[model samples]
Target: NLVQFGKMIECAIRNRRPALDFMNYGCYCGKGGSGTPVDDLDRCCQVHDECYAEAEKHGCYPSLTTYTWECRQVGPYCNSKTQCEVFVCACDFAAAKCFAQEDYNPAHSNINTGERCK
Candidate 1:
């Protein structure tokens, strides 16, 4: 999710939240993996890592740097592709992006299968 990527602002962040955070630990445990969320908290952590890899692979826009928040703040667009689009448009508009899902196309991706969602 691009919005998740935003929490998570910092150069070299893909979809991976904790790794990015780990890179910027700064003696502050601002990493998303340090928290207790739903059932698959580990999986959620993986998503951020994956996102970081994705973002780095693909070039990002300028001014899309700066990590001043937390991952959960990107709640809405994290799991929903449709919502991801909104996040994309909104974040991009404000230059507030982190990383949009590469597989986030509603027409092509099965992001709506609702299988990985618990």
Candidate 2:
């Protein structure tokens, strides 16, 4: 299942990078906001988007598929069973680490519809 796969990705990231954190904006990690990032935290998501594009360039279909669900259902233990999964997981993990390194404020968030950051 994707749930298990997600857990494995989280575990790998936690082991490699001790300071895992969370923040998202635009269409990279989350959706329904501007394509452009609002700040450094949002830029992390942009970087993740670019990473996915690079993965695709490597001939790896780094997008989720029903096959992934079926494969996990068959009991392989959910640890990036395919090249695509590996690349996708890596991208997300990188984004998470990037988020950890940056500071986050609701004022810089894309979802903030109030006054500008000026």
Candidate 3:
């Protein structure tokens, strides 16, 4: 009885569901195969893959257009020459998480884009 009501409500809400999720994994630092260790960024996909997938099943329009641990300014090698902080996407650049590099650093005052997790 109550279960049926809940299902009906769910169906109705699906018609205008809000954006499923938006993740800002703050900043991270790591070294890949050939690239130097640097600050990286991640979408909800890498950190929360399972959950995002489940939501997709329920008619939630969610996707990760940007997915990759980015880097800027400082890398493992740039430590001595530059600050030991990972720059966020100072520019409006990005790329695939599990694939190639996508550099999108725009020409803005805020050239670095990254945040610390609480």
Candidate that would win on lDDT: 2
lDDT of 1 by residue, 26-94 (tens): 111123233232223233334444444355455533235332333454432223234333333334322
Better of 2 and 3 by lDDT: 2
| TM-score per candidate | 0.25, 0.51, 0.17
Candidate 1: segments with Cα more than 4 A from true spot: 1-39, 61-64, 67-118
Per model, how many backbone clashes are there?
13, 0, 11
Q: Candidate 2 on 1-118: residue-level lDDT in tens?
A: 2343344434534433222223333334453233556678677767866876787788765555212322233222324567766666666656655665666665454454333222
Error of 3 at 48 (Å): 1.5
Ranking by TM-score: 2, 1, 3
Model 1 lDDT at residue 89: 32
Q: Candidate 3 at residue 55, lDDT?
A: 39
Would you give me the overall lDDT of model 1? Answer: 0.33
Model 1 sits at a Cα RMSD from the real structure of 15.0
lDDT of 2: 0.50
